[PDB]
Amino acid sequence: GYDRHITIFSPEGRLYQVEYAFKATNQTNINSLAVRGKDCTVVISQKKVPDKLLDPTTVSYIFCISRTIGMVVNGPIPDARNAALRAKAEAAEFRYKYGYDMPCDVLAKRMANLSQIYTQRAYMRPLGVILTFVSVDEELGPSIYKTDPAGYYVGYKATATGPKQQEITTNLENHFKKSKIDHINEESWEKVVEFAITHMIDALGTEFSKNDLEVGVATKDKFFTLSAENIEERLVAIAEQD
Amino acid sequence: NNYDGDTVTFSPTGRLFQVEYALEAIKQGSVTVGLRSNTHAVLVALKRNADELSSYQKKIIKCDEHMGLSLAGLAPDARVLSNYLRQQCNYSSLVFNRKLAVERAGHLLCDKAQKNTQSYGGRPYGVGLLIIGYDKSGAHLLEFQPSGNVTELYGTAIGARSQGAKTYLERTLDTFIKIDGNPDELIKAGVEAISQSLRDESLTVDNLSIAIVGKDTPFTIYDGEAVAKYI
Amino acid sequence: TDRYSFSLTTFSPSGKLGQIDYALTAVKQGVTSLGIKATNGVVIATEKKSSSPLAMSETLSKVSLLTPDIGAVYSGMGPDYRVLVDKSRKVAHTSYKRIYGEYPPTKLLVSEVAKIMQEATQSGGVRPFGVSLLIAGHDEFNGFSLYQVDPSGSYFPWKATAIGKGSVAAKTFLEKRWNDELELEDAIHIALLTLKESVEGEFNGDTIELAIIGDENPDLLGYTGIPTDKGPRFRKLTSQEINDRLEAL
Amino acid sequence: GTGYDLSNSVFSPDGRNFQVEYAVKAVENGTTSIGIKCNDGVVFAVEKLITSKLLVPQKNVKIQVVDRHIGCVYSGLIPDGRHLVNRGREEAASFKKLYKTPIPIPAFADRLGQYVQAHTLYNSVRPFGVSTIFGGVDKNGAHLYMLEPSGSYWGYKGAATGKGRQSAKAELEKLVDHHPEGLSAREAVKQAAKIIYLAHEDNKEKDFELEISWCSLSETNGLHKFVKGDLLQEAIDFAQKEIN
Amino acid sequence: GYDRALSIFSPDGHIFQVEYALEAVKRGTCAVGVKGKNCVVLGCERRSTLKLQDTRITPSKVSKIDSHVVLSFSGLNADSRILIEKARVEAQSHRLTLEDPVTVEYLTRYVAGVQQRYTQSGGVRPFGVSTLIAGFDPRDDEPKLYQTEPSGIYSSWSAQTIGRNSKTVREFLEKNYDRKEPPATVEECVKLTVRSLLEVVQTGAKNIEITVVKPDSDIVALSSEEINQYVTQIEQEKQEQ
Amino acid sequence: MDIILGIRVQDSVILASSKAVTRGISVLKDSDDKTRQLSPHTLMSFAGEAGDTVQFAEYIQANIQLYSIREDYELSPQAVSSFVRQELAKSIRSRRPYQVNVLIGGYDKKKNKPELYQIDYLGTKVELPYGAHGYSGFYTFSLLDHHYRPDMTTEEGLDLLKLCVQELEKRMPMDFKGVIVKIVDKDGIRQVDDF
Amino acid sequence: QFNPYGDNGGTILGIAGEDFAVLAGDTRNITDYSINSRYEPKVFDCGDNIVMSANGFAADGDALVKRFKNSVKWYHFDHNDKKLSINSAARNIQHLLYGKRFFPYYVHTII
Amino acid sequence: GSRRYDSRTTIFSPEGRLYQVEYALESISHAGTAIGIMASDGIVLAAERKVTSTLLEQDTSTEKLYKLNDKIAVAVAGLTADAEILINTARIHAQNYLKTYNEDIPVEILVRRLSDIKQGYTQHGGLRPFGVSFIYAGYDDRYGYQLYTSNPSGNYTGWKAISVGANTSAAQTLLQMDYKDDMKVDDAIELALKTLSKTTDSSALTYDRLEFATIRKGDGEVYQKIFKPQEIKDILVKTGITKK
Amino acid sequence: SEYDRGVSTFSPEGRLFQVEYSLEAIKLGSTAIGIATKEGVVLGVEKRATSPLLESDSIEKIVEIDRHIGCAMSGLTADARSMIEHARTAAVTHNLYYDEDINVESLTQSVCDLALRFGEGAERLMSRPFGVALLIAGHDADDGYQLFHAEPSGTFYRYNAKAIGSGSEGAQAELLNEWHSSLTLKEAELLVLKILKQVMEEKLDENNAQLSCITKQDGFKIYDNEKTAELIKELKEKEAAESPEEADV
């Protein structure tokens, strides 16, 4: 019937447009992983620029929401930029109305409630994107909170999203199962970036050049995306290690 | 079969069908021809009657003292579009003391028609238009289709048997483009163009409508005995 | 341009409301959550099943506070539960506290949430909420109360009940174990036993959420000086307390 | 099941919006338009098929100006492209009014992208039927963007859309490979004329008229201007010599 | 916000919602109206005869719009209450703005216009009600009887029936109503009305309820005893053959 | 202003209203009935701002007649008074309020008792044995308070109203051109032929 | 405070003949004791042999003249090409003026 | 666009019936049984809880009998939540009438208001009707005691004794068999209890599965009494249905 | 797919569905014949009463728009009330605005403007086009006597003589053969009566048909039944006295 076109329950009690949006999230064929350091938070995303006619500096799936919150999106770039603009506006309005910067988990809950509205109302479709917000919240420390097209959101010690997410997740899980902690015990954020890149190389099983990665780092007073040369420096430091 | 219910449906081949149905409504309409020289612009239209007791539907509408149009298809949609064009010319003349440019009028008509071909509810317009005008740039002839496509031409025709008039104007292009300063000769050229598109019919005083605009010649309509000298 | 003004949930020739039954099915396919009423408090409990061990289960609250004396747990679609908890927290103030200067009674707050969910079942362009709620509250005149709210907008007062996957069997365990002379700790023990019956994975204070509407806790009030104002009745048990009562078992 | 391709914003079991892809099909049926980013600006070019010699040449403009520095050319359903250009002009007016400085090219690109992406969100509106190549010069230099009916837009060294999009893309790849330092504005104009002439072979059914515009910090002082007169004839002669 | 076009044309030229409302009228109880020389009689059949019903409070089929005009109906009672409310409100408004009570033709035209609007508005289905409006114009002794159908058509009738088995009662009336000699006395009009209703009700007199309207707002509903007297008188002639 | 008086005798309510309407320096009419029969057993006299009085009275009349037709029942005088008071109270805080004062005289058939209500343009309703709107009371009350008995007959009430009208015709700076007197009892509302 | 009205002086005169009419006006436009212009005509030909002047507030006069010319244009458009009779023009001008009954065109009008 | 998903609730069948009205009546047919009986000196309402469980808190449970006014009460058959919405609206309308006229709401006026609300929901709006049937038991000084019934169709009628919900045919047959105009309120109580015990789909009729209410005259004042569980058990053991 | 497509949908042949369906509904209507001559315009209608108990006087299918404009209807006559109201109000409003009578063509155009005011979305409009055609007759000083046919397609035509409704197809054929530029008023009345009697299912008398005229002098006059009956007798005597013959050939 038509229970597969709009956001109404199927006889099995399932919303099929939500599941199809989840499926659409992997259209980019790109994987992203987020981890927490001792006082920072790192996100790594695959950078795939097929056409050589593309300006490689305009191909990005990591967005600077506020000066503290960064958001990496798994999904097509239209819905990605839609969610990015909405989250930026929400953070600005929060700062204006309540006098302090919008926390990571608060913005995640807001975006997840909007996704729930899309899940219940029929005139709007869900966004085929998975949003991973990262920051260093002043009360909570390094914070990673993820939302999906179903309206569900939750925080992670570390997370992964994309086609190979499970693999990455397992890898990450294993490391923490070995470390018995909930973060990467390193003072500098460069080493946490190197850790994330190393474990992504381990999980995916592919070698990355400086133009194959996007790195976003959130420190207690900033969120910034690394340049190609800083990524190359991190890759060289990884290559020198054993 | 499917993809023809709304104007909001694109079809697998990328074709908007309701717009094509409006174009077909134009094709099944009456014959109207337009042609312009450097100094004048003439619309020649073949009016059609329901039967021998009915009148002949007016096909040419005056929009402003410098601009008019001929219709082919749904007369109500033609009236709506001509009223919008009158309003735009009126706004130009009152707020800016400026005669509305023919090209800008065509752009406005295009956007007005496109607004209907992208939103749920509401049908695209069902009439093709041939707009003649004489602005500060000179003489202008525009062809408007409810798809939103407006094109400026030296001469054209829309409706039934339009290909005959179009081919005649193509052959006579170098001839009529130089008919400057002679209104009656351009009118005769338009009459010949529209005659090249008649089948088993003859132009009479009752079925022919003419419109003339140009330098030192406001948009004037000729019907009835006024066209007897051209038949 | 919300053209979806017509109802999405209509009556079938069989008399069944389609989307209502489908939401009830979606509830049945959810993790089990139970509630037990005692003489000096109520208990609500549920399993905190996480997707990945990397995910922080504490950051996701299945037992939420509505008012200082009213809390709620759910079974079904998490996002619906979050938006309903927000709507309920707001309706408690807008349609009661700001009018009568006191927090709403459990019955009226349950009725407000039920009205919201019924409108979801009847309004245009909306699907019913895919959740079932167990709300435990305390007010001065009606004492302690435990209510169940279904997607249809109906609500029922329960001495003890459960919802979700292993609900039916759980309810049987409650029917044989419940009595009208039960203390709060006894109800906590019975709830823990029933949940252990209804859980497959690990069963510790980190995989179970459990809250109580019990005595007044002035240590959680935040201010001292008003003798009439006492502490809230709602208290979420710490992981340590749940693990202690498990070590007792 | 089936029937996921009859309503806009409906996700198929794949995760696609088939109406958007059908609009892309409508785009592919349109004429060829290209944009080339040079070292100090951008150059836009488009082919106008001469359906009849009754068409007045040099009229029926296809490249639209936004603000005073942005150029836009769309391949596909021309009326939808005009609608999109009008919306972009409204966005530029708003931006300049509140924020004194004229709207930057990335801001304008994001505005158009959000507009189209909104058009891919409801079953009451059909997706846009034009792929639009646009751009210009802002305080950060030259920018060239291309926007698809899906709302997806990207910054390009060179972009092309329409029937002859593949040959144009190949020629743009050749120019990007052979000129790492970057092209000049006038050279970009002549190369764009050549690329239009080469891409016309894909839709060689009817003769065409070339239309070129450019926005260059040095050649046009940063303003979008239509290439006319001697430069147009020189580019046409360059292309005609390359063809034969 | 719901403007779904429910009353639309069919390829053969029909408006199926209007015809289905007419069918709903066919399933309704029978009502009849007869014009005398100085009175109008409205009769209505009741659904069988149930003794668990409360006959004192159940709304009767004949409702007064104004002290001089009454309206009976056949079809959905719920849809009839809306028309009755609108008609009473419009009668009071016409009294307020004209200082003259409504004429029967004016009230009938208003009801017909309301129904016609309901046959051409979005998100709205036509009324499943057909009405008979009877009375006397102010300062006028001429009887007035009109019929309105869900399609919005209104027309005057010497005598007319609407509802279930309306074809039979209309045949009976066309047979037994002399336009040249209308029922002179009120008794003759009530007798013709009760015979018309008894040709279809088949049950007892409890099914038939009669109201009579005479000029200057003289409207009275007949008691069951008078109805029994009329049915006994008509049946006595039936034995005569 | 205009004279609006009312008295409640046993099994009756008598209302007196000035016959004069004067706009400017010219008395426009000497035969003005400042009353509106809301229901067969409930009458309402009105006075105040020009135009607003008749408009408000006819509006209330239409509402009461519509209620009586819908329910086939006559509203009690208390219900009509409460309705009129609510209407005036909604009016006072509107954009352009009604400046109309009314006396409602009715006969409650359920109680078989006469009832008289005084309501001002503000919505202040009181049930009183004798009432008056405007400066009229400033005189009439002093008489009534002395000469009013609860067991008075309708003729006694008419004589008392005649004494009040005489006092008004003596010590008032205006000529209200007589009064129209109406009696509301169990048999309905009648108009005294000449007062 | 802002006074939305002003006086530009001027005087107009209309005389009706047997087979003719004459509407005249001074060409002087002033403000207080200063002259704004010595040739700002106030008697306008609106077509259909209808001359009109609205003397007083020059802004309101120009506005009313433009509105009446627009009204004759739309009258021609909507009613084939029937000439606007002087009585019809007078009634239309009455409606134009009464449209701003509570913000009157501070002009005395003569056609 | 969205028209393909519109259920069109307010449409006629070819026979002249409201689809959603019939389907809501079918829904209510599966609901619990509610019976009202109007005697010469009172009115009695008796309703059966269809869903019953050993852990259901019946002390604070109210799913069948609700107080519209101190003089008017309602027995509900069908969807509880829609009924509660309608009950709130009815209470508000009654209090508005009281505030306007300083007289308690007449029963028929409230019943007709609710029925007109239902009718509006069955003629416009495109929304689903309320799946609720109401039995109003009221008192006013005009018609004395009054028993009314309303269904999703928007039609309301008056009865001496009536039943809505499940097994209405057998219940109505039994009531018509045993009802007398002269019976008193206690006889009506006995009749309602016996009809419920003979029309119950459950094993036996017990106090936990029953809601009871009496609007009586005992002073010249009416009392609206909603029976407590113990009072229900007492009247059950007294009428001989149960043993104690 | 009747209720499954848009109400303003175009047919593949380039026509509107609802417009053609309303034209069919008009074809299922009563007959209405108008004839315009230099002496006046005559309109005749078939009342088509459903039962003999219907009082044929209440079948008003010829209405007065203004003293100089009359209108006959054919089809769903209920739909025509709003159009007649709009026509009367527009005529008197033009009179108020310009102190003159509105032209016939202007009134017809103002009426036709309402035809295509149907569709969904929004101020709102109508659900369906009108199901009735109009013969609008009148006289003005500019174009003399005029007769117009107004359809629900927003299109209007000036006919010297036009028949609409059920028996229009044959009637029009008769009109085309019976009309000339020197026809008189009585001749037009007799022709309307003759063609009505030919196309009517019932025998034409003064009770099932209705005549009316528009003259520059007297205005719009609806013929009372007695004058129509006298004209019917005159036409019967005129037809009974015709003497053609083709017995030779």
From Swiss-Prot, chain B:
Output the InterPro entries linked to this UniProt entry.
Ntn_hydrolases_N, Proteasome_alpha, Proteasome_alpha-type, Proteasome_asu_N, Proteasome_sua/b
Glycyl lysine isopeptide (Lys-Gly) (interchain with G-Cter in ubiquitin) cross-link site: K188
Report the domain of life of the source organism: Eukaryota
Per the UniProt record, which residue ranges are transmembrane? Answer: none
Keyword Lyase carried by entry: no
Q: Which residues carry this modification: Phosphoserine?
A: S11
Q: Which UniProt keywords apply?
A: Cytoplasm, Isopeptide bond, Nucleus, Phosphoprotein, Proteasome, Ubl conjugation
PROSITE patterns reported for this sequence: PROTEASOME_ALPHA_1, PROTEASOME_ALPHA_2
Residue spans making up a coiled coil are none
* Gene Ontology annotations for the cellular component aspect, listed alphabetically: nucleus; proteasome complex; proteasome core complex, alpha-subunit complex; proteasome storage granule
| Pfam families the UniProt entry points to | Proteasome, Proteasome_A_N
Instruction: Spell out the subcellular localization from the entry.
Output: Cytoplasm; Nucleus
What is the predominant subcellular site recorded for this chain? cytoplasm
Q: Which GO biological process categories is it annotated with?
A: proteasomal ubiquitin-independent protein catabolic process; proteasome-mediated ubiquitin-dependent protein catabolic process
- Biological role stated in the UniProt entry: The proteasome degrades poly-ubiquitinated proteins in the cytoplasm and in the nucleus. It is essential for the regulated turnover of proteins and for the removal of misfolded proteins. The proteasome is a multicatalytic proteinase complex that is characterized by its ability to cleave peptides with Arg, Phe, Tyr, Leu, and Glu adjacent to the leaving group at neutral or slightly basic pH. It has an ATP-dependent proteolytic activity.
> Which family does the entry's similarity section mention?
Belongs to the peptidase T1A family.
Any other comment in the entry? Present with 7210 molecules/cell in log phase SD medium.
Query: What is the name attached to this protein's record?
Result: Proteasome subunit alpha type-6
- Tell me what organism the protein belongs to: Saccharomyces cerevisiae (strain ATCC 204508 / S288c) (Baker's yeast)
Curated annotation (Swiss-Prot), chain C:
- Protein keywords: Cytoplasm, Isopeptide bond, Nucleus, Proteasome, Ubl conjugation
Q: Supply the InterPro entries for this chain.
A: Ntn_hydrolases_N, Proteasome_alpha, Proteasome_alpha-type, Proteasome_asu_N, Proteasome_sua/b
What family classification does the UniProt entry report for this protein? Belongs to the peptidase T1A family.
What is the protein's quaternary organization?
Answer: The 26S proteasome consists of a 20S proteasome core and two 19S regulatory subunits. The 20S proteasome core is composed of 28 subunits that are arranged in four stacked rings, resulting in a barrel-shaped structure. The two end rings are each formed by seven alpha subunits, and the two central rings are each formed by seven beta subunits. The catalytic chamber with the active sites is on the inside of the barrel.
| Free-text function comment from the UniProt entry | The proteasome degrades poly-ubiquitinated proteins in the cytoplasm and in the nucleus. It is essential for the regulated turnover of proteins and for the removal of misfolded proteins. The proteasome is a multicatalytic proteinase complex that is characterized by its ability to cleave peptides with Arg, Phe, Tyr, Leu, and Glu adjacent to the leaving group at neutral or slightly basic pH. It has an ATP-dependent proteolytic activity.
Q: What else is known?
A: Present with 7060 molecules/cell in log phase SD medium.
CC per GO annotation: nucleus; proteasome complex; proteasome core complex, alpha-subunit complex; proteasome storage granule
Covalent link (Glycyl lysine isopeptide (Lys-Gly) (interchain with G-Cter in ubiquitin)) residue numbers: K107
Main location per UniProt?
Answer: cytoplasm
* Localisation: Cytoplasm; Nucleus
Swiss-Prot record, chain F:
Q: What is its main location?
A: cytoplasm
GO biological process terms on file: proteasomal ubiquitin-independent protein catabolic process; proteasome-mediated ubiquitin-dependent protein catabolic process
- The answer to whether the entry has keyword Phosphoprotein is yes
Q: Which Cys pairs does UniProt list as disulfide-bonded?
A: none
The chain residues annotated with the modification Phosphoserine are: S76
| Compartmental location | Cytoplasm; Nucleus
Task: Please list the coiled coil stretches.
Answer: none
Q: Does the keyword Acetylation apply?
A: yes
Gene Ontology terms, MF aspect:
endopeptidase activator activity
Kindly give the CDD domains that the UniProt entry links to this protein. proteasome_beta_type_2 (cd03758)
> Which Pfam family is one of those matched by this entry?
Proteasome
UniProt miscellaneous comment: Present with 21800 molecules/cell in log phase SD medium.
- Subunit architecture: The 26S proteasome consists of a 20S proteasome core and two 19S regulatory subunits. The 20S proteasome core is composed of 28 subunits that are arranged in four stacked rings, resulting in a barrel-shaped structure. The two end rings are each formed by seven alpha subunits, and the two central rings are each formed by seven beta subunits. The catalytic chamber with the active sites is on the inside of the barrel.
This protein is called what? Proteasome subunit beta type-4
From Swiss-Prot, chain I:
Q: Where in the cell is it found?
A: Cytoplasm; Nucleus
Which residues get modified to Phosphoserine? S51, S243
For this UniProt record, give its keywords in alphabetical order, as a comma-separated list: Cytoplasm, Nucleus, Phosphoprotein, Proteasome
Q: Tell me the residues on which Phosphothreonine occurs.
A: T50
A GO-annotated cellular component: proteasome complex
The residue ranges crossing the membrane are: none
Tell me a GO biological process for this protein.
Answer: proteasomal ubiquitin-independent protein catabolic process
Predominant localisation class? cytoplasm
Q: Which miscellaneous remark does the UniProt record hold?
A: Present with 17100 molecules/cell in log phase SD medium.
What's the family?
Answer: Belongs to the peptidase T1A family.
Question: Which function does this protein serve?
Answer: The proteasome degrades poly-ubiquitinated proteins in the cytoplasm and in the nucleus. It is essential for the regulated turnover of proteins and for the removal of misfolded proteins. The proteasome is a multicatalytic proteinase complex that is characterized by its ability to cleave peptides with Arg, Phe, Tyr, Leu, and Glu adjacent to the leaving group at neutral or slightly basic pH. It has an ATP-dependent proteolytic activity.
Q: Known NCBIfam families for this protein?
A: PRK03996.1
Q: How does it assemble?
A: The 26S proteasome consists of a 20S proteasome core and two 19S regulatory subunits. The 20S proteasome core is composed of 28 subunits that are arranged in four stacked rings, resulting in a barrel-shaped structure. The two end rings are each formed by seven alpha subunits, and the two central rings are each formed by seven beta subunits. The catalytic chamber with the active sites is on the inside of the barrel.
Query: What is the official name of this protein in its record?
Result: Proteasome subunit alpha type-5
